[PDB]
Amino acid sequence: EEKEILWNEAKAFIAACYQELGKAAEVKDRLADIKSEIDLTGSYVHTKEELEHGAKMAWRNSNRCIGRLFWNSLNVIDRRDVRTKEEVRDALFHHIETATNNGKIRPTITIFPPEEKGEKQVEIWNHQLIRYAGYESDGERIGDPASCSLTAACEELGWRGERTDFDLLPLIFRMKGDEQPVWYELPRSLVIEVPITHPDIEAFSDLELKWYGVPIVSDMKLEVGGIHYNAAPFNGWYMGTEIGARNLADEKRYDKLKKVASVIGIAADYNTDLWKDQALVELNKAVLHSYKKQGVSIVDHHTAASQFKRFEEQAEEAGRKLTGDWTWLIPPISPAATHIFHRSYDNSIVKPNYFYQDKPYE
Amino acid sequence: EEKEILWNEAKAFIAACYQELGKAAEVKDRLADIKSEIDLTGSYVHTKEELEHGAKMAWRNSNRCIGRLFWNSLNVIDRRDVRTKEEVRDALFHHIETATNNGKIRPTITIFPPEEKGEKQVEIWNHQLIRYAGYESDGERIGDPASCSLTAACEELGWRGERTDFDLLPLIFRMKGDEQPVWYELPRSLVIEVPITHPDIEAFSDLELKWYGVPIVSDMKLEVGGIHYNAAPFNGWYMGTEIGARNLADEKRYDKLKKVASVIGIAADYNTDLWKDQALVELNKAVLHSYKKQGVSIVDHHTAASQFKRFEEQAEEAGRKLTGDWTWLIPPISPAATHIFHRSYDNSIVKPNYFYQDKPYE
Numbered sequence: 001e002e003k004e005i006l007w008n009e010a011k012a013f014i015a016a017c018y019q020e021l022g023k024a025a026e027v028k029d030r031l032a033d034i035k036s037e038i039d040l041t042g043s044y045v046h047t048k049e050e051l052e053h054g055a056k057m058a059w060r061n062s063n064r065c066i067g068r069l070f071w072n073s074l075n076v077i078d079r080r081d082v083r084t085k086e087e088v089r090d091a092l093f094h095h096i097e098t099a100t101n102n103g104k105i106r107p108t109i110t111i112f113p114p115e116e117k118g119e120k121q122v123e124i125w126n127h128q129l130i131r132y133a134g135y136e137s138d139g140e141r142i143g144d145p146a147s148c149s150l151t152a153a154c155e156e157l158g159w160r161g162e163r164t165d166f167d168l169l170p171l172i173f174r175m176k177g178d179e180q181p182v183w184y185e186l187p188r189s190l191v192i193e194v195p196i197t198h199p200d201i202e203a204f205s206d207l208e209l210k211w212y213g214v215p216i217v218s219d220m221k222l223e224v225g226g227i228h229y230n231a232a233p234f235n236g237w238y239m240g241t242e243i244g245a246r247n248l249a250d251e252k253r254y255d256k257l258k259k260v261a262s263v264i265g266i267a268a269d270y271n272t273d274l275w276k277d278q279a280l281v282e283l284n285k286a287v288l289h290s291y292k293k294q295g296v297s298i299v300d301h302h303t304a305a306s307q308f309k310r311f312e313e314q315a316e317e318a319g320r321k322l323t324g325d326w327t328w329l330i331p332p333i334s335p336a337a338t339h340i341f342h343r344s345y346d347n348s349i350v351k352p353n354y355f356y357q358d359k360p361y362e
Numbered sequence: 363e364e365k366e367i368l369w370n371e372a373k374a375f376i377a378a379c380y381q382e383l384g385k386a387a388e389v390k391d392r393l394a395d396i397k398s399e400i401d402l403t404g405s406y407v408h409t410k411e412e413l414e415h416g417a418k419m420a421w422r423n424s425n426r427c428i429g430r431l432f433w434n435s436l437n438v439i440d441r442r443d444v445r446t447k448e449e450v451r452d453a454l455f456h457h458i459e460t461a462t463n464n465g466k467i468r469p470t471i472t473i474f475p476p477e478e479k480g481e482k483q484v485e486i487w488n489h490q491l492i493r494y495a496g497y498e499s500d501g502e503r504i505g506d507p508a509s510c511s512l513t514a515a516c517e518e519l520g521w522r523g524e525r526t527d528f529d530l531l532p533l534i535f536r537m538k539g540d541e542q543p544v545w546y547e548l549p550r551s552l553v554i555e556v557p558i559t560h561p562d563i564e565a566f567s568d569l570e571l572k573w574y575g576v577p578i579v580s581d582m583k584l585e586v587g588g589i590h591y592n593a594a595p596f597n598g599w600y601m602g603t604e605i606g607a608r609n610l611a612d613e614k615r616y617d618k619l620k621k622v623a624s625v626i627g628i629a630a631d632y633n634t635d636l637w638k639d640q641a642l643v644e645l646n647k648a649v650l651h652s653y654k655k656q657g658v659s660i661v662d663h664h665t666a667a668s669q670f671k672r673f674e675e676q677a678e679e680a681g682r683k684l685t686g687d688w689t690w691l692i693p694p695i696s697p698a699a700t701h702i703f704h705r706s707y708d709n710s711i712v713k714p715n716y717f718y719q720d721k722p723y724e
């Protein structure tokens with residue numbers, strides 16, 4: 001039955017992909033072989049070329065992503081050959097090292113074997129490969145609240161965090177046929193971190209804030225021509241506001257604005273003073289200053305929006321419809337200072353693409 | 363035919379209105395009379411009570427409005443009796459005076475005769491009763507670009523602006539049966555203006571910015587039970603960001619951020635400095651400081667959002683569905699610091715309500 005669903009998604013994708021590749025003539029034949037492989041096996045296998053291009057198309061079609069200008073330069077690592085948990089661990093470790101590139105971050109995706117019958121071969125439990133643990137007990141709040149449930153899941157499995165506010169969570173993933181996942185502590189030599197300082201307020205270091213260099217989202221599914229790559233972690237570099245305006249700012253995350261207000265020497269007593277706003281701007285200047293100073297890639301929300309404008313222009317020139325989610329494309333500080341705020345975007349879902357999937361903890 | 367449309371909108375509205383008024387028993391009879399009046403005349407007439415409540419419901423159902431907590435205290439002035447252009451002028455003048463209230467702004471709406479057959483009795487050309495003129499010729503840009511087309515329309519009709527950046531546009535409106543509108547210069551004694559100063563940067567006054575105290579939107583149609591009040595200007599007080607983050611900030615409006623950056627003594631050379639953001643925050647602090655200091659009502663975006671949260675809670679307690687437009691409800695600075703950013707809103711249109719209508723110039 002579902003060989004139907006597979007076949008159509010496959011037809012649609014190969015047509016578009018080979019088209020974009022200048023390989024339109026080779027379609028009729030490639031579709032032939034696929035049509036057979038699906039009938040005989042129930043599935044089909046992407047060539048390295050198809051997979052590379054599909055991953056890139058997927059990034060292109062991500063409505064919520066402001067960084068899409070650079071879709072065609074995505075570094076694609078094809079790890080469909082892994083069979084063991086040591087191989088998976090080692091692939092994840094390598095992804096971190098190669099994407100980090102001593103600070104000159106390379107947008108990279110590592111692609112693991114896809115689901116078979118809907119049966120996962122590898123299931124990654126991390127939300128990002130590098131993420132801080134979070135604890136809550138007895139009114140005591142430590143670390144990143146967003147991580148509380150995964151952190152408790154790890155500590156069931158024999159891991160124990162030091163309970164600093166910046167414990168690195170271990171890599172944790174499950175292999176097909178194992179009832180439980182395995183976890184591996186991150187080698188600290190692989191993980192770049194950036195201490196947050198302010199370009200001119202020396203007291204800012206008193207907050208003793210830091211963040212990791214590279215966000216590597218490891219819990220979304222990549223879908224390409226009806227093939228489901230549930231384990232396919234990817235990364236770009238950070239936009240400063242993600243760190244300065246959310247991770248460090250949100251009440252349900254690190255909730256640092258009162259503390260920022262104090263070190264920058266303004267009162268946090270009256271709404272009409274806009275002290276949250278002033279705090280947000282200084283925290284965000286500090287984050288950009290710190291990353292740049294350490295030689296770790298980052299982009300500010302203005303430059304990002306200028307880049308996205310070129311992505312829009314480039315879509316038009318190529319004859320491709322542009323899709324977008326305005327509510328995620330606008331930055332969370334000074335959104336109306338970007339062109340994004342002042343236009344609308346069609347939020348249709350086009351495949352290939354990256355999707356949410358159910359967490360296996362919680 | 364359309365006596366149908368009128369009758370249903372009328373049924374729906376009277377039911378809800380009398381319900382909310384504790385007057386449910388009086389519905390069957392009120393609907394009777396309306397049912398007759400529609401058959402015999404093609405239309406019906408709202409009692410003062412119905413009109414007052416409908417205007418209030420309309421404000422309640424305005425998805426894009428963050429200030430809805432205070433819907434039930436709207437001051438409703440019923441001017442369905444006007445017949446002459448001197449009466450219309452004088453009603454508009456009075457609205458300005460009573461809503462301004464020496465700075466202690468009263469949310470007010472003045473309601474003029476409704477459309478008859480779709481035939482307007484009074485057509486107001488102003489977008490707000492108090493608005494600045496705008497000019498563009500020979501690379502020369504003066505005043506508010508948003509006003510360029512109405513400003514050129516007035517100058518056709520024999521008005522002439524002084525071409526400062528803050529010329530007050532005249533009131534301009536057309537009466538049924540006149541081919542052309544009339545215009546009347548605003549008496550400067552009626553219009554409060556606020557010079558923009560900064561609480562601690564004395565140089566800020568060098569920008570010589572100002573804005574008017576009371577935004578009185580005069581080009582939307584109020585619709586209540588199938589009756590179309592195309593001329594029904596209303597006002598609240600300003601949220602600071604409307605002035606500081608848009609009117610004065612937008613590139614297509616007064617475009618003051620570079621000038622703000624200079625007077626606050628920061629460079630405007632690098633995106634990574636977030637100088638636009640820092641400028642926005644200081645301009646916005648200045649606007650709140652200036653209004654408060656002059657004793658003219660204004661609300662900051664945090665307090666506003668706290669109020670809107672209570673509106674949400676109050677809707678729930680009353681059994682009413684909440685509708686909202688997230689893309690207009692979030693403020694344009696520090697939106698993620700408000701609860702609004704972190705939830706979703708249903709954007710359905712519920713009547714009574716305020717609607718856009720076609721401009722008669724341009």
Ligand code: HEM
Pocket residue numbers: 055058059062064065066067068070074107108109234235236237238239242299304328354
């Ligand atoms: C190169 C630098 C990149 C930047 C600066 C960037 C920027 C962003 C930002 C700011 C968001 C919003 C995330 C949030 O607010 O939680 C986002 C979402 C997203 N980005 Fe990118 N991105 C980049 C690269 C990538 C890459 C390489 C991919 C995949 C190949 C990707 C796919 C996505 C997806 C799928 C989302 C939405 C996830 C969701 O719905 O939660 N981006 N991006």
Ligand code: HEM
Pocket residue numbers: 417420421424426427428429430432436469470471596597598599600601604661666690716
């Ligand atoms: C009492 C103080 C009030 C505040 C602070 C307030 C705040 C706001 C703000 C900030 C907007 C967004 C406007 C924009 O960004 O251009 C807005 C939209 C709106 N408000 Fe309110 N408002 C208030 C009173 C009122 C009143 C009295 C009414 C009508 C009775 C009203 C009806 C609306 C409508 C219809 C819109 C949307 C107009 C459109 O679609 O362009 N508001 N309000």
Ligand SMILES: CNCCc1cccc(OCc2ccc3ccc(N)nc3c2)c1
Pocket residue numbers: 215217219220235236237238239242
């Ligand atoms: C704040 N949103 C959290 C909910 C959620 C759940 C799963 C994935 C997810 O991704 C956000 C996301 C995804 C990809 C990114 C790529 C680069 C980048 N700088 N940020 C990125 C941010 C976000």
Ligand SMILES: CNCCc1cccc(OCc2ccc3ccc(N)nc3c2)c1
Pocket residue numbers: 577579581582597598599600601604
């Ligand atoms: C920036 N939007 C301009 C487009 C447009 C066209 C016609 C009306 C309009 O209203 C915005 C609006 C409406 C009512 C308001 C009431 C109070 C207030 N403080 N702002 C308010 C702002 C807005």
Ligand SMILES: C[C@H](O)[C@H](O)[C@H]1CNc2nc(N)[nH]c(=O)c2N1
Pocket residue numbers: 326341342343344689690
């Ligand atoms: C709908 C579309 O996103 C459009 O850019 C909206 C965004 N929100 C807005 N908000 C305000 N206050 N004023 C506007 O003109 C717009 N435009």
Ligand SMILES: C[C@H](O)[C@H](O)[C@H]1CNc2nc(N)[nH]c(=O)c2N1
Pocket residue numbers: 327328688703704705706
């Ligand atoms: C869709 C709904 O508006 C929701 O609050 C969205 C808004 N935009 C967001 N933007 C980011 N970056 N992260 C989020 O979690 C959300 N949540």
Ligand SMILES: [Cl-]
Pocket residue numbers: 215242247
């Ligand atoms: Cl993150």
Ligand SMILES: [Cl-]
Pocket residue numbers: 577604609
């Ligand atoms: Cl305005």
